Amino acid sequence: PTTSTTSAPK
Amino acid sequence: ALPAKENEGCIVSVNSGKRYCLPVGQRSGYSLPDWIVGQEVYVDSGAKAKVLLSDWDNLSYNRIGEFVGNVNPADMKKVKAWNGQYLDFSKPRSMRVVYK
Ligand SMILES: *[C@H]1O[C@H](CO)[C@H](O)[C@H](O)[C@H]1NC(C)=O
Ligand SMILES: *[C@H]1O[C@H](CO)[C@H](O)[C@H](O)[C@H]1NC(C)=O
Ligand SMILES: *[C@H]1O[C@H](CO)[C@H](O)[C@H](O)[C@H]1NC(C)=O
Ligand SMILES: *[C@H]1O[C@H](CO)[C@H](O)[C@H](O)[C@H]1NC(C)=O
Ligand SMILES: *[C@H]1O[C@H](CO)[C@H](O)[C@H](O)[C@H]1NC(C)=O
Numbered sequence A: 001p002t003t004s005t006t007s008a009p010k
Numbered sequence B: 001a002l003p004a005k006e007n008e009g010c011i012v013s014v015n016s017g018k019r020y021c022l023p024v025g026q027r028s029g030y031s032l033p034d035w036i037v038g039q040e041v042y043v044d045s046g047a048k049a050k051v052l053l054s055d056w057d058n059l060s061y062n063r064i065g066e067f068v069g070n071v072n073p074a075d076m077k078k079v080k081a082w083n084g085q086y087l088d089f090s091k092p093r094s095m096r097v098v099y100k
Helices: none
Strands: B008-013 B019-023 B041-045 B049-054 B065-067 B094-099
Touching: B008 B049, B008 B094, B019 B094, B041 B049
Parallel strands: none
Antiparallel strands: B008 B019, B008 B041, B049 B065, B049 B094
């Protein structure tokens, strides 16, 4: 749940 | 080149020998610095430290492998990750150092 994530390229 | 101090963890570029180190208790930026990110590395973790790596940015999705001592990249290619898979951490994009 409380895992880090990334953003898709912007 | 210079060995990790006891409370520090390092990765070292195989191509250049340049070291990227963090004290215990710190993590990288979203990505490692441009001068090292995604280059092949060895681990040199200090005597009291453990290096956490991800093959992705931002220590993300439990794609995290644990490394102590001196580890060569050939041994980093199929490593049990927090997410249950065997991942390749030899070209990491993010890092955290903790106490062993
Ligand atoms: C994330 O935080 C929650 C808070 O309830 C739990 O501590 C959970 O186990 C945590 N997960 C991870 C991957 O750290
Ligand atoms: C993942 O990144 C978040 C920020 O987006 C937090 O720094 C979190 O602690 C990271 N997870 C790990 C395991 O370091
Ligand atoms: C990653 O995505 C999650 C959504 O699943 C959160 O938006 C989180 O803030 C994101 N982290 C980063 C660093 O973009
Ligand atoms: C964020 O970046 C990682 C790589 O660092 C993965 O490509 C992940 O799938 C990305 N997340 C999103 C939401 O695109
Ligand atoms: C963190 O990563 C785990 C990996 O199993 C899940 O994709 C989780 O949904 C992520 N956290 C958020 C906030 O999207």
